Structures are given as structure tokens and as C-alpha cells.
Amino acid sequence: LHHLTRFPRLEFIGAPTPLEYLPRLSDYLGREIYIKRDDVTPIAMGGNKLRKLEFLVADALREGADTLITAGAIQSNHVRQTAAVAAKLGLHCVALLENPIGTTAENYLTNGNRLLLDLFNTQIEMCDALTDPDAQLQTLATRIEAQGFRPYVIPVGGSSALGAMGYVESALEIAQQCEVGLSSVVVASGSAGTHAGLAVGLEHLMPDVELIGVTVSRSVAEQKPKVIALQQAIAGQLALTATADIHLWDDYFAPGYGVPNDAGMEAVKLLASLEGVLLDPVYTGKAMAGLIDGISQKRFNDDGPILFIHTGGAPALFAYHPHV
């Protein structure tokens, strides 16, 4: 795994993020539950996207870029973290945003992550839909370049093979921190970089552990090709083999990306009330709902300890309140 040091990398996090036992949640579910606190990173309310940006933005600087361009929903955590990093480094930031849920709710449209974008002086470009994100970002990049800037394009969710190296890094922390008998790891699976990064790292570091991605936007059939593709791409770049099966549960995100559901919201309440831990309605709440039902349906490989990867997202709580 030494090839990770060959990639340029900025230091946004520093020390490994905490890995904690959750004794009250464990007592309630009758199962040992641990949490990787990737929500606690120091930049602009934190999250998983920061691990990716350590690599992506290092690349951006290597190319001498002065502008970061990315895309996501109005309430995207990735756009928020990209914009914070841009501000920190004196780079301009252009965000291509969509309204994925057709809401006119004031807090969704203007509060939460979207509010922070304004504080970070993000240039906002609206679009009807992100039907072809890569191509749409490329078009915007040319226009911004025509204005006299030197743009660097960061893909949706920061999920490229390079971005996903942040989660190979996270896997190293996990492996060091777990040295008890961990059986399963649960993570939200969205743009797939987090899932795929963890997949490559955990195959080599903790081969006996089962990694489960809980989809937040797509069926198993649509999502599996995406995760596998990144997995193979990451593996090649690190000069590793990656043969582990990708596991995905798609039962926990209906009626679609960015729409809260009851199981998800109840998971948010459960973690807040038992552990003082804040999840979110779009990602971690749905992923935790998956973990809980996995216990209910005896869906994991065995009865042993489960590690939940907290990827962040809590600023969305304030955007989604009171509804829509």
C-alpha cells in the first residue's frame, strides 16, 4: 500500500479521526456497534468529502489552477466542503447546482449547506438537472477559462480514482484502530468513491470483514458497475489487485436521492437520543437505517461487531427542517 505516498496530498485533517464504541446503541440493538467519526474533520463542519479533496486539490495546485469547479444538489456536502477549501486556499469556486427534489421550501433553497456557499463567496450556476455531470462541468469550465481563470474540474462527489484515495487512507486508520473481532462495516454508497476507496483498502488490510454499501440514490443494479469501476481504477493506480465482491443494499433510500424517509429519520433520532451523534436525512440516516434493518433481518454475514462509517452531512438537518 506504499504507492499512496506517491500522490501529492494536502493536509486538511491531520490526526486520524476517532473510532468510538457506541455502548447505548449497542445495548439497544443487542449488537456491538462502533463508529468511525469522519464527520469530525476540521474544515467547515466536516465530512467524508474532505478526505477526497486532500488529493484532488493537491492535483489542482500542481496544475497551477486558480479556480475549483464542481457540481451537486443545492444541499450538497461536497460543494460546501469544496467551497470552504477554495476559500481557505485563495482559489475561486464555481458550483453547478440542481434541485433534485422539486422543492420550493425556503430552508432547502437558502439554508444549511446552501447558506454556507454564500459565506464562502461561491459563484453559483443553476441548472435544471445534472443529466450528464462530466460533460456539463466541462462546458462550464471552458466558459470560466474564457473569463481569464484557470479552472480545475472536480467531479460530482469528488469521486474519481484520485479522489477515492482519501478512503484508502481512511481504511488504514480503521485497520490500525480496530487491532476487536470486527465482522462488518457499513457505509453510505452515493457517487461511489467512499465505498470503492474503502473496498480496496479493506480487502488488503482486513480481508475477513464484510463491507456493505447502503445506496442513497440507485438500485444495486445501477450502482454496482459504478463501485466496481472505481475499485479497479483505484487498484491499478496503487499497483494492487482487487478481487473482493462489492456488496450493496438498496432497500433504504426510497423514494429517491435527497428525499428523507421515515426509517432514515428514525435512525437520526435514535443516534441523537442514544449517543449524542448527529446523522443526516440524505446519507447517514439512510445508511444507519440499513444497518439497523440488517440486524432485524439477520442480513450480515455473522453476528459479530459492526463498524458504521460516519461520513457527515449534519448541516443538511437545518435545510430539511421543518419539511421538504
Add this chain to the structure above:
Amino acid sequence: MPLHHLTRFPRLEFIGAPTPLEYLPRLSDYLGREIYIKRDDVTPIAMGGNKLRKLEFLVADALREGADTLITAGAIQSNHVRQTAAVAAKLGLHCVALLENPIGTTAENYLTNGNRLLLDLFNTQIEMCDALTDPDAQLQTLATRIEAQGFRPYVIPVGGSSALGAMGYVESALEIAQQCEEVVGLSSVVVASGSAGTHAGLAVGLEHLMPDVELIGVTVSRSVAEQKPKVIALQQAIAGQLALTATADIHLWDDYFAPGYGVPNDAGMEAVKLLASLEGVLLDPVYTGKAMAGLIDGISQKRFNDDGPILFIHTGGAPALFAYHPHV
């Protein structure tokens, strides 16, 4: 060596490792002065903040007493209440909160979003009152009612600001001294001064570890005349508990909080926008935005002892941004 009596006070571990102390190169470039930041806003519990350091001592005391319930008070958008509630949930303690609306707003996000929203997630029992006219007395009346239900209550004062709670910031000063060692020779430290525990704890710690550093408290709710005896009372009580003397004068600037506690002002807003746009750092309209506006003006007016490096204590507060939006 000098702060060794801190050992005798029981404490829970909520923070873990020392919080980051960071240079702010873009802010420093703009202000023409070396600016560092102590990131007490980045702690692991429910969006972080200064109040957590106090809770390490207060809640340890509660557990030693056999208490199963935490009672405290503050504004609807109190960070202290939010952090207290989060710790209570984590430890399986009941939490009861006496809340007031200090600004008389009817704005829906102030009333129900931000910190207030999180209170419901932590299952806090919420008690409204017209105003916290006598917080200590009102807390005791509530404690009596709660005790009558069979609960074993532990009353935490507004802001967590008792001599015991303030030990959290004596501890913070130890981190600061260690982090600055052979790295930076600080001239000044700036912190928001509210219920006064943070200011007072830092005052005691810094007098002993870094006596030549100038500690500036920027008031968020009171004039220098009203605030200073509160800080001094705590400073002296903290020193006593540690078998130390504290002879340092307390310094406060009160020019930066008008028109009052919990009301945003223009300079505060501009300080929030400055830190966000230059450093990707999130301040808040009630506390840190106002303290930072003080730091900035202090530089502009040459209010500090000299032209040397300034450390800003980031005490947190950012969830209030979502409560104050779009207006109050």
C-alpha cells in the same frame, strides 16, 4: 508544574486530543498582523464548542454525586444547552432545559431551527420562561419540581460558568502554551466574554504559563463595568481551588456587541464573512463574529499592547448561523 492541582478534579473525556492551533495566512495577510486560531469549535460532540471543555468537569462532578439528570438554562439558541443535551444523551442522563427568548423575535428559524432543532433530537425536556431574570433561583425551583418526580438533578449554571466548569479553560491554556512552544511567541489572545467561565479559566492558566501575554475578552452581552466583576469573581475562585494566586488585571472591550446580546450587528456580520471567505472558517452572529470584529478593530485602532501575534480562541457557535438566517 504550577497548575498541578488540576489533577485532583475528576474529568470525563469528551474532547480527546488537543484541538488544532492554526495559522491564518490569508486573514493575516489582510489584517497586516500574524493571526492564529485555537479551534475549540472542532470537538467530537454535536458540532463542538467551548462549553464542552466545561462539561468534562461539571458532568464528572454530577456522576460522582450520583445524579441522573442535568438541568441548565440559556437562550433558545444557546450553544451550552445544546452541548449539555448532547452529553446527557451520550451518557443516558435526563436533561431539562430552561429556555428564554432574549431578543423577542418571532422568526421561525430562530424559534425552531439551529440549536433548538438539535435539542429535540437529544430528547431534552424543554421548559420555557418569559425571561431569565434570576437564573440561579429559577434553576433551583425547576430542580425542586424535577426532584419531586424522583430524579436526582445536577444544576449547571448558565454557560456552565462556575469555578469548576472554568477548569476546562485552565486546561485549554496548558494546551495553548504547549502548542505555541518554540513555534510562536504570542503577544495577545482574544476570546468572547459571556458568562465569563472561558475568559476566567484562560486568565488563570495564562497568568501562570504565559505571564507576558495580553488576554482580551470581547464582551457579547454586558458593559466592561458589569462584566469585569463577574470575570474577576471566577478568576479568584478558580485560583483558590488550585492553591494559586491570580494577580493579573482582567481586560475587556465592550464596544462590539451593541445593540445587545443575541442581536447581530454589521461589524459582526462582516467578520463572519471575512473569516468564511478568507479562511473557510465559520464564526457566528452572537459570540465569535462579535469577538472577531473586536480583534479586527483592535488592530485598526492599535488597541493591543504591541504589534505581535494574536491568538483568537474560536469558541464555536456556528449552528446559530442557520437559526439567524434569513433574519431575526
